[PDB]
Design a protein around this ligand. Structure first.
Ligand SMILES: O=C([O-])C(=O)[O-]
Ligand SMILES: O=C([O-])C(=O)[O-]
Ligand SMILES: [Cl-]
Ligand SMILES: [Mg+2]
Ligand SMILES: [Mg+2]
Ligand SMILES: [Mg+2]
Lengths: 216, 218
């Protein structure tokens, strides 16, 4: 079932630079097409699993994002058909080792250690598509230890969800249960061991995660 | 329930790739080896088993072949020591890390992800599964690759800068590996372009071979 998509889904695709105010806080520039990177299936941390800090970062950031879960195999589809391939949604955190990412960008290296480590994708319960007639009218929020740190409106996305789906599908075929993370609004920032993150989509879902270090 | 490793590309979730693992490839790229292997990812839909085409992306004019040994995981592998790492291997496959090299040069220059260069649909042509029992030492293999009958790449897995047990241990500490995940262990020298309708043949001497046609989609 899609209600447990993180258990069997193979691929995670992430969009970068999709909120103008996040682009500004990063001091980057918006390109003509969305930036894409990948996370492995073992990046998923469903509720009840910890956010795990990698030992090689001293600057682990939260990033609040809407995930789009695919309901059917999606290969090179037009924008106008792209929503037909969506099964539903989930709220994700694109946990990011920001210090590692800065080095990767500077040296022209892959973004893997910065973005694609174990438990780098905390994920909410699945929200069926029927509950979200317009994914560009959602409000996202995130708290650390009870204090609000990120909020965003999906109406602020530079690239629309039907564009993202179509764009990704032409580069990488998407299977049933693959997710696309659609980028973070402004307000990214560090977390430390034992922080409690609470996050949600207003009116639809919330989730709580503890930041931990590996006990192995 | 469980599915056979003989068809790992059909159900396996993740592809992890090592960069800069053969000194003579590093030289031809004019790069440098770091203290640790470079890692990048491919999606499950990068897999092109025999009988499927290599698909050229529309956005490249310089699609390169890269000949690599793949290590297929047989058991869930989380943060394991080097000395235990081979216990987690199920077997092997020969892969091509198809690379849009023009796109990769731009990505490096702009500090962007290597995704469009490395991680597109059909970017991982893959041989038949070779069970671990047939390869007691994966660092004593000879790899070869032909384009239209002409030899273009050959390599010896003894030349790997980082060993397979090191790579598995290193990767497992960063990214937990599931049963049926593959690790591509890097290319020897001789990478080069292919064009539409080229025939690629490749093999591990004495163990496996495979043939792929280069096509454009639909
Ligand atoms: O680059 C990113 O990850 C983003 O914009 O969310
Ligand atoms: O960087 C690479 O792809 C390699 O060395 O195989
Ligand atoms: Cl990358
Ligand atoms: Mg995957
Ligand atoms: Mg992000
Ligand atoms: Mg390679």
């Amino acid at each position: 079932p899609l209600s447990r998509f993180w258990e069997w889904g193979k691929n995670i695709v992430c969009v970068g630079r999709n909120y103008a105010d996040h682009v500004r806080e990063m001091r980057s520039a918006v390109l003509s097409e969305p930036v894409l990177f990948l996370k492995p299936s073992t990046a998923y941390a469903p509720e009840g699993s910890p956010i795990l800090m990698p030992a090689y970062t001293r600057n682990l950031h939260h990033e609040l994002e809407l995930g789009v879960v695919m309901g059917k195999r999606c290969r090179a589809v037009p924008e106008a058909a792209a929503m037909d391939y969506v099964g539903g949604y989930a709220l994700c955190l694109d946990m990011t080792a920001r210090d590692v990412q800065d080095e990767c960008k500077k040296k022209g290296l892959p973004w893997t250690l910065a973005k694609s480590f174990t438990a780098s994708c905390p994920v909410s319960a699945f929200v069926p598509k029927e509950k979200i007639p317009d994914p560009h009218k959602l409000k996202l929020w995130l708290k650390v230890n009870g204090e609000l740190r990120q909020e965003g409106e999906t109406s602020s996305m530079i690239f629309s969800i039907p564009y993202i789906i179509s764009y990704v599908s032409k580069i990488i075929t998407l299977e049933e249960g693959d997710i696309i993370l659609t980028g973070t609004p402004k307000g990214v920032g560090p977390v430390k061991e034992n922080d409690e993150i609470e996050a949600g989509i207003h009116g639809l879902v919330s989730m709580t995660f503890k930041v931990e270090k590996p006990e192995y």
